[PDB]
Amino acid sequence: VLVPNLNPTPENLEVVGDGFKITSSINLVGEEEADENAVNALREFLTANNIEINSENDPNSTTLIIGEVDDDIPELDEALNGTTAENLKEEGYALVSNDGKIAIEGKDGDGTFYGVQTFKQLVKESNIPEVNITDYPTVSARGIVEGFYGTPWTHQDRLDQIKFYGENKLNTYIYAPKDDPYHREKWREPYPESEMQRMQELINASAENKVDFVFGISPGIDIRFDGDAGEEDFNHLITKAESLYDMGVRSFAIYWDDIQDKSAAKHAQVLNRFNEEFVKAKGDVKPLITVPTEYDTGAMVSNGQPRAYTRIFAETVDPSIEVMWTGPGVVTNEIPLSDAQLISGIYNRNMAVWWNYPVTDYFKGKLALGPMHGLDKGLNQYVDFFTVNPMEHAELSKISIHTAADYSWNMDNYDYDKAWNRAIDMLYGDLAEDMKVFANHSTRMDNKTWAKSGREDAPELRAKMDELWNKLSSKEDASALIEELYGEFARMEEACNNLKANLPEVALEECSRQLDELITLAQGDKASLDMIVAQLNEDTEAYESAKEIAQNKLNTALSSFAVISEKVAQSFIQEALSFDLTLI
């Protein structure tokens, strides 16, 4: 009967029947012609779910028809009956399940692969709803830049992320880890033989999952521009791009974010010459990507006008080059429309976003587990390339990334709170509700100086806490609020304990300290209510005892590497410890 959670949210989805059960084996039609990567994803899923593929047609098994438009599969059009991917953008598809048949038709092979990804999420214990779907992304490039500091992702982490990206229709991975010398400290040098299997596996997995593997190069450490030294180095840039092209790389990024020679004319000259002698010469290289030395609005702009570097870089840089920026600051609350309009106007093109959330390198004690937040829903008007910088914690990064998939693919309809719930529901199974209790307290990022972003932690709990203080300081009966808060603090503790016992190690090793910290805080939150009740009861001894625990729990939190719920579970102890009911 019902349509499961879907991510991203399809553009158009109509329920047209009560649904049906897929048979124990199926008829597969269009495999000769249909995108290979998409057929493999389909095969994999079928296997994993014990659905066999018929040698020959029809024990009256379910029929699945797969292809792109323009492929020669007369059965696909019949099954799609009226619905079509032909008028859809690149990466679009149509999917129709009706009365024992399932048709998947991509606008291109990419589209077909994404239709498979949709199909996979639609099927629950062989049961599938009866839907008409047409679907396509809001933003052309959607993905990850691996630009965080700290402990690098492992090879296995990257392979898993790439698969995760394909499943969620993210099509871009910018590979530029701090741990790989061949992107920076040895930027001139081709990868040696001992590194090639590793690199090939990443390239291969990217292609298989329709992920654009973008090689990020940072020559800024020691590149020369002037004269013949300049000449020799441009040529190293070419020979290095070539060695990457030869192992299958089709996208390239050149970063200027960390260079000493801060010359916009020279950065843009390298880019333009590279666009010309490499990108264009090759024919099948995706647009060149760049990070200019000024990459946030505060560094780029002064009194609504571009600063000199940005003025020159923008007037010189080829119109086809994607230019990245982080928003109004490097790590900021938001990108309003007006900011994207400003930077897009300066560059006279659609911009590329390097969004520094959920990255936590600037404040490592805290996990960033909230949704895309603060990004304007009209952003696509000025941006056609959207990436997030994630945490060194690859596994827990998936909650925010999940929401980013939904935001960039279906932006008009993005609802950060429903996207966030659905992320956890989708990733955590029977642990979802406990995982929400914990992650809810761990969305807001703020290093107290230059970097802050994310949804506020536990907003509803923070509002209840606020109500408590104003009831207690207004002589209004606070008993119900006290009772309710006791329930909520007990639940925080119960959820975290179930997560410690049952989360798999891949997640647990990322968050075990933050779990213990939320427990400690819940325990001080409880002692804090005990302090209030003791004052109401005029029991001095019960007051002093509750205060000591509250203080102790807060002291543990403050002395721990792990950070969580600063303004909420933590601040509440501080608030309680300073509160005195006798003065009201």
Ligand SMILES: [Cl-]
């Ligand atoms: Cl998902």
